[PDB]
């Protein structure tokens, strides 16, 4: 062949690898046939979710005055968002702890 080897990631305008996603859909024993729109679409979805979470985590790093995302920042990024909490309610993130949540009746009556 004589052609510029344009990868399917760049062909789809994406960053996550369509080839690795495609060969994991093949090796992962999900169906007999696996298309091309399926790994393109799935790389797009995964890139969007990774983008949104790393966005919120960079935001929580900024709020913590840091330029390196730690586990705690992923923890805050997921658990302070409602839909990421719905996505990962049954998921433990290590080295993250919990949100700084203190109930109202446990506080002293500062009135």
């Amino acid at each position: 062949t004589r052609a510029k080897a344009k990868t399917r990631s760049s062909r789809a305008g994406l960053q996550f690898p369509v080839g690795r996603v495609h060969r994991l859909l093949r090796k992962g024993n999900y169906a007999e046939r696996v298309g091309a729109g399926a790994p393109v679409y799935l790389a797009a979805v995964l890139e969007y979710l990774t983008a949104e979470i790393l966005e919120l985590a960079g935001n929580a790093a900024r709020d913590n005055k840091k330029t390196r995302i730690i586990p705690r920042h992923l923890q805050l990024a997921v658990r302070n968002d409602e839909e990421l909490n719905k996505l990962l309610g049954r998921v433990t993130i290590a080295q993250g702890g919990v949100l700084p949540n203190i109930q109202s009746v446990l506080l002293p009556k500062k009135t």
């Binding site: 080295q95 919990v98 949540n101 009746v105």
Partner: protein, 99 residues
């Protein structure tokens, strides 16, 4: 002359201090001994990666912190601020783990 705080203020101070921190609260070596003791009753001469025991500790402490969260909600619901084994049993019962 010696200063002493009220109970609620140091209690809330520790609540804040440990809800801000991320480090593992159970010590590493007694948890490792507990893991080997429980493992012993399944197969003799079992070995463990360090990251395996760290994963066990991360998940165990996260599980107990969610458990104490639900236990505190049971206590607060029962017009108390003191958690009780009643509250732990109610929490585990509603979560479906009583088996």
């Amino acid at each position: 002359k010696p200063h002493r705080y009220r109970p609620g203020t140091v209690a809330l101070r520790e609540i804040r201090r440990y809800q801000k921190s991320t480090e593992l609260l159970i010590r590493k070596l007694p948890f490792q001994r507990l893991v080997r003791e429980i493992a012993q009753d399944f197969k003799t001469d079992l070995r463990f990666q360090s990251s395996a025991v760290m994963a066990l500790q991360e998940a165990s402490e996260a599980y107990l912190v969610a458990l104490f969260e639900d236990t505190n909600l049971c206590a607060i619901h029962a017009k108390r601020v003191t958690i009780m084994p009643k509250d732990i049993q109610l929490a585990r019962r509603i979560r479906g783990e009583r088996a």
